[PDB]
From a paper:
Type I fungal FAS forms a barrel-shaped complex composed of two reaction chambers. Six β-chains form the walls of the barrel while a central wheel, made by the six α-chains, bisects the barrel into two chemically identical reaction chambers. Therefore, each chamber has three complete sets of catalytic domains including three acyl-carrier protein (ACP) domains. Substrates are shuttled between the static reaction centers by the mobile ACP domain flexibly tethered at its N and C termini.
In both our activity assays and cryoEM samples, the FAS enzymes were pre-incubated with cerulenin prior to addition of substrates acetyl- and malonyl-CoA and NADPH to ensure KS site was inhibited prior to the start of the reaction (i.e. KS-stalled state). In our high-resolution cryoEM maps, we can see appearance of additional densities immediately above the catalytic cysteine of the KS-domain in the KS-stalled state suggesting covalent linkage between cerulenin and the KS catalytic residue, which confirms our activity assay demonstrating inhibition of catalysis at the ketoacyl synthesis step. Stalling catalysis at the KS domain drastically alters the ACP densities inside the reaction chamber of both fungal FASs, as judged by improved ACP density near KS domain and weakened ACP density by the AT- and ER-domains in S. cerevisiae and C. albicans FASs, respectively. With the ability to observe ACP at the ER and redirect this mobile domain to the KS, we focused on conformational differences within the ER catalytic region of C. albicans FAS. This site within C. albicans enzyme represented the most pronounced alteration in ACP localization upon stalling catalysis at the KS-domain. In both species, the major improvement in cryoEM density of ACP at the stalled KS domain is observed at its canonical lobe. When ACP is shifted away from the ER domain in the KS-stalled state, the catalytic histidine is mainly in one conformation facing FMN. Weak density can be seen for the NADPH in proximity of FMN in the KS-stalled state, indicating partial/transient binding that does not clash with either of the histidine side chain conformations seen here. The observation that stalling catalysis at one site (i.e. KS) can affect ACP localization at other sites (i.e. AT and ER) in the presence of substrates within the context of the fully assembled reaction chamber strongly suggests that substrate loading state of the mobile domain may be a contributing factor in ACP-mediated substrate shuttling in type I fungal FAS.
Residue numbers in the entry:
A (entry chain B): 341 to 510
B (entry chain B): 1190 to 2037
C (entry chain A): 1 to 93
């Protein structure tokens, strides 16, 4: 809000992904995000500052922030128009998914896709383009082992999902 | 598809038909070549019919660049400019073009909440079908096929708005240079592109009909001369040029220095003899009112000459008004290899966008016919590439900063080639940055593009210091080092000593404690009369406009007068502020001499720098008037306070830091404090300086109220009881009495010391040491009318060039930018209750 | 407004502006907030003997225009003629 108080809503910044408790992803015009982390570099402190001798409540906030190698303002209003164009391209073809078998938890709502009154594609696109991501809320599991097939691996979603469910025995 | 057709035509004649397809309408067009077959000779069995060859090539290219729509008309006049055609710049064209050049500058991609901008290189897209029509006319007859694009140059008209995505744009271009160089027939065209009639930018292209041509009859050249500034000092000089029959003055006014803005029209008869020269131009005189009036004209006219005499005479006997001031050492903008580009794979995308279907870049067969290394990249593309490069690497991706760009197609680039460019800032012009570039083929290191770009500076603003910062030796290093700066100290002191009897340079250099003016012989009396004539006004209790004398000590008997300042004369207000305005104007002028001043600057000054500002940026007054008004102001505000026996006052000024008192002590805190402490003791006390929020406030008034306040601020600091912290503890009225419980105890102390109370430093108060006049306060409000008189007779109304004041000037009375709107008059009049401005505000309608 | 009408207007307005400036408080805080916000100037060049306004501008930046510059990614560079000779003349070693 400090940052957006200076800019119009076409450069407004919004929360995009919630990767956990202290793991968030912001989206917006790259220069605006640049300014935001500029504010941060002021309100923040270096990592080797040794606040051991100053009591707790009056310590300086410490963080780690850097741009992800992504080249699109996903899960924001910045692509709100692309939603209709993409689903129109869908209507251009026979792109649709039949009834599911394993329940798939929604990312934003957290509900099951088998309980969808709409098709699934029109939902998943609005889910990728505009709506944010509530990951841990979406992965409110009843699960023993978790398999990530995504990219990165040792740097992938697996590691942060691990750190999210550390003591739940998964 | 068929690209080549060789076939017999009517007996013993061959028609080599060279075909090209990718056209305006993709309609295949043929380039008919003719060759005569000769069985008689075998050593040369086939000779090409050379007659009418250029016309066959020209009609081909006409159908190319225009399409079979317009009939090939070769009868184009060279003299008249060539018209273009109104085209609407749409967003789709902009996008296609930017993609074709690979430009990422976000000012051109459509973003919400911001006007879609078009690239400056789009003018050639707008003006090509107008530019190239200049090489078609019959008089310029040559091998159209061996044509080479030599150089291109962009130049935005100073103050022109860059293109938007709705602009209805037309194009007018005229041909300037047609000269048979030893390398061929050069042709230069300049295109003045229009927007609703107003011209926006100029594009200067440069082609070359390579080969050899001796048509010295249809060759010519029109050039505008560099504006030369000739200075006349002796008496022969004025007769020297008056002897020149080509010189012809029409006004019989004396002149010191003259600026010659001229243009010529050459017509050649051989390599170097000029069959005709018509060089007309204007001679201009710079008045002290900064109004430039043409003294006369220049009219030379001759035949079979070897040079333009007017230009030569201007060169050796006068210096030009040069604009490209060069550094002695250029600076590299960025170092490394991050400035590397790559040629496209195919030139067809660029061709279909730029409308340039030149088959040199698209077809192997033509590129081979001209024996050139292959389908080389479009030169215009290579231009726009480096342009978009420097647009971000030199202007930090700010599009509107580039205002002119010119380059020279030194070499050719085949597609897909990787190009590395260097980028260098070498000089300055009109406050915008000169940036020189070289794009060399990185795998061969030979240069390809040597160019030049004029990009703006960051949005700058100039503030000028006020009084209080004075010290001995101001700019004396600059005065000893900068000629143009020395010419303002010398222009000013020799005005002082000849009108007031002292050298300001001596005052600033060896600051003494006293100065004795002497009214000696004739010119001695001719000075003391000036001192006598100074009659200022201080509205007394009578209110009458008492045209009273400043120096009651100077009369028809006083032979000599003495000034005294115990600290040093450089501290006396009437002498310090001339020194300050001189040093500031000297620095400003020396800077401007280097072409360091942007055109969109905003300026202001702090209570003295204001005068040195509107005299510098707006040049409202020459130096001789500026020193007079600043000296008269110093004296007026000086004698304005009734003094003691020593010349000292019961008045003073103090600077306060509202932070050192308490973190809760806001701007409203100390201003409410001044309001109450001045309204109770019925003394005069004002904060006159709003310098820094809660860090620097400077209050003025009688020493009594000043110490009363420097003590209320001490006792509210030791008690930490803030008036704003009483707003939640007390009401609005009972705080007005709460502060009374405190202000009386310290008003007693204000009266407890000798009335000219030497203000002692409070807890968070640092008084103004050295001055005792409460300037910018309503106390001096009486003495304004005489100063207002002095201004309206020292400031020539004709010198006011308001266009540079609107928005660019921030007064200190009204901190919003100067601008002549009715509300602005309202805001200033409700702040000063003037008569002259309210009078014009009532009858405001006399504006449009 | 015809150039002659506005010239009369500008002349009289400027005359009275300077005349009463002599006795009316200098409104420099808001002047700074104008030439820093309404214009967002990058280079602020003070000309004088001592950087009395450079120190008067750095504090204004650090007080009221930090979040504004960060939100807009502006790197305001203050410069005074006293010390910043090489930097204003664009010929710095």
């Amino acid at each position: 809000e400090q940052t957006n108080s200076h800019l119009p809503r076409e450069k407004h910044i919004a929360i995009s992904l919630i990767n956990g408790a202290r793991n968030l992803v912001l989206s917006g015009p790259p220069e605006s995000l640049y300014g935001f982390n500029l504010n941060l570099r002021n309100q923040k402190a270096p990592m080797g500052l040794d606040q051991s001798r100053v009591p707790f409540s009056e310590r300086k906030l410490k963080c780690s922030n850097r741009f992800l190698p992504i080249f699109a303002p996903f899960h924001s209003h910045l692509l709100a128009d692309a939603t209709e164009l993409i689903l129109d391209d869908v209507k251009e073809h026979g792109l649709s998914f039949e009834g599911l078998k394993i329940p798939v938890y929604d990312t934003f709502d957290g509900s099951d896709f088998q309980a969808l009154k709409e098709p699934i594609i029109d939902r998943v696109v609005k889910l990728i383009t505009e709506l944010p991501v509530h990951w841990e809320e979406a992965t409110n599991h009843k699960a023993t082992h978790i398999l990530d097939f995504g990219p990165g691996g040792v740097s992938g979603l697996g590691v942060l999902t691990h750190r999210n469910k550390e003591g739940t025995g998964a | 598809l068929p690209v080549v057709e060789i076939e017999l035509v009517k007996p013993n004649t061959i028609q080599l038909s060279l075909i090209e397809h990718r056209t305006a309408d993709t309609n295949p067009v043929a380039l008919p070549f003719l060759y005569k077959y000769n069985p008689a000779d075998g050593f040369a069995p086939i000779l090409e019919i050379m007659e009418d060859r250029n016309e066959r090539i020209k009609e081909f290219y006409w159908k190319l660049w225009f399409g079979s729509s317009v009939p090939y008309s070769n009868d184009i006049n060279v003299e008249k400019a060539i018209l273009g055609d109104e085209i609407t710049i749409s967003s789709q064209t902009i996008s296609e073009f930017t993609h074709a050049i690979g430009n990422k500058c976000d000012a051109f991609v459509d973003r919400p909440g911001k006007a879609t901008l078009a690239p400056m290189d789009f003018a050639i897209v707008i003006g090509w079908k107008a530019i190239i029509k200049a090489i078609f006319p019959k008089s310029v007859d040559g091998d159209l096929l061996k044509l080479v694009h030599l150089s291109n140059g962009y130049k935005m008209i100073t103050g022109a708005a860059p293109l938007k995505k709705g602009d209805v744009v037309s194009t007018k271009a005229e041909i300037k240079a047609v000269l048979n160089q030893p390398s061929g027939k050069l042709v230069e065209v300049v295109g003045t592109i229009y927007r609703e009639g107003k011209p926006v930018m100029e594009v200067t292209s440069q082609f070359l009909y390579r080969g050899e041509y001796n048509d010295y009859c249809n060759t010519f050249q029109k050039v505008t001369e560099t504006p030369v500034q000739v200075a006349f000092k002796s008496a022969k000089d004025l007769a020297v040029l008056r002897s020149k029959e080509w010189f012809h003055l029409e006004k019989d006014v004396q002149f010191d220095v003259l600026t010659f803005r001229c243009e010529s029209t050459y017509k050649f008869k051989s390599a170097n003899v000029y069959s005709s020269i018509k060089t007309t131009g204007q001679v201009l005189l710079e008045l002290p009112t900064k109004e430039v009036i043409q003294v006369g004209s220049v009219d030379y006219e001759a035949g079979t000459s070897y040079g333009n005499p007017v230009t030569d005479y201007l060169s050796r006997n006068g210096k030009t008004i040069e604009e490209s001031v060069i550094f002695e050492n250029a600076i590299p903008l960025s170092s490394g290899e991050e400035l590397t580009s790559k040629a496209p794979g195919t030139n067809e995308p660029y061709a279909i966008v730029s409308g340039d279907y030149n088959p040199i870049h698209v077809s192997r067969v033509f590129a081979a016919y001209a024996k050139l290394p292959g389908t080389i990249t479009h030169g215009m593309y290579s231009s726009a590439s480096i342009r978009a490069l420097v647009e971000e690497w030199a202007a930090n991706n700010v599009a509107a900063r580039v205002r002119a760009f010119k380059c020279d197609f030194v070499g050719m680039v085949l597609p897909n080639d990787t190009l590395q460019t260097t980028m260098e800032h070498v000089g300055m012009i009109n406050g915008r940055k000169i940036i020189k570039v070289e794009t060399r083929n990185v795998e061969t290191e030979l240069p390809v593009l040597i160019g030049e770009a004029e990009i703006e500076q960051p949005t700058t603003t100039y503030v000028f210091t006020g009084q209080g910062s004075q010290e001995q030796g101001m700019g004396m290093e600059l005065y000893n080092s900068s000629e143009v700066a020395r010419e303002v100290w010398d222009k000013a002191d020799r005005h002082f000593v000849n009108n007031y009897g002292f050298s300001i340079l001596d005052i600033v250099q060896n600051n003494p404690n006293e100065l004795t003016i002497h009214f000696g012989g004739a010119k001695g009396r001719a000075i003391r009369d000036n001192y006598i004539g100074m009659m200022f006004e201080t509205i007394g209790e009578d209110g009458a406009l008492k045209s009273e004398k400043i120096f009651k000590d100077i009369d028809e008997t006083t032979t000599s007068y003495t000034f005294v300042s115990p600290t040093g004369l450089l501290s006396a207000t009437q002498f310090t502020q001339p020194a300050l305005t001189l040093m500031e104007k000297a620095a400003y002028e020396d800077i401007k001499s280097k072409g360091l001043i942007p055109s969109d600057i905003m300026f202001a000054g702090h209570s003295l720098g204001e005068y040195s500002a509107l005299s510098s940026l707006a040049n409202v007054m020459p130096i001789e008037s500026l020193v007079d008004v600043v000296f008269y102001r110093g004296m007026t505000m000086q004698v304005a306070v009734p003094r003691d026996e020593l010349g000292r006052s019961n008045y003073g000024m103090v600077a306060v830091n509202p932070s050192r008192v308490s973190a809760t002590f806001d701007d409203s805190a100390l201003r409410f404090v001044v309001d109450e402490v001045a309204n109770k003791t019925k003394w005069l006390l004002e904060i006159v300086n709003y310098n820094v929020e809660n860090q620097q406030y400077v209050a003025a008034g009688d020493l009594r109220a000043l110490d009363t306040l420097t003590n209320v601020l001490n006792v509210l600091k030791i008690n930490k009881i803030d008036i704003v912290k009483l707003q939640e503890q007390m009401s609005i009225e009972k705080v007005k009495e709460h502060l009374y419980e405190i202000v009386d105890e310290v008003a007693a102390k204000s009266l407890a010391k000798p009335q000219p109370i030497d203000l002692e430093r409070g807890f968070a108060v640092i008084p103004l040491k050295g001055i005792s006049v409460p300037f910018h306060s309503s106390y001096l409000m009486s003495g304004v009318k005489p100063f207002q008189r002095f201004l309206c007779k020292k400031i020539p109304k004709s010198s006011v060039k308001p266009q540079d004041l609107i928005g660019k000037y921030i007064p200190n009375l009204t901190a919003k930018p100067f601008e002549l709107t009715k509300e602005y008059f309202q805001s200033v009049y409700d702040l000063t209750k003037s008569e002259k401005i309210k009078s014009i505000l009532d009858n405001w309608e006399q504006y449009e | 407004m015809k150039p002659e009408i506005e010239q009369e207007l500008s002349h009289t307005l400027l005359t009275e502006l300077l005349a009463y400036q002599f006795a009316s408080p200098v409104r420099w805080i808001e002047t700074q907030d104008v030439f820093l916000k309404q214009h967002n100037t990058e280079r602020i060049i003070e000309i004088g003997p001592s950087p009395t306004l450079a120190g008067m501008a750095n504090r204004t930046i650090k007080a009221k225009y930090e979040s504004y510059d960060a939100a807009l990614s502006l790197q305001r560079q203050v410069l005074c003629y006293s010390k910043d000779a090489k930097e204003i003349y664009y010929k710095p070693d």
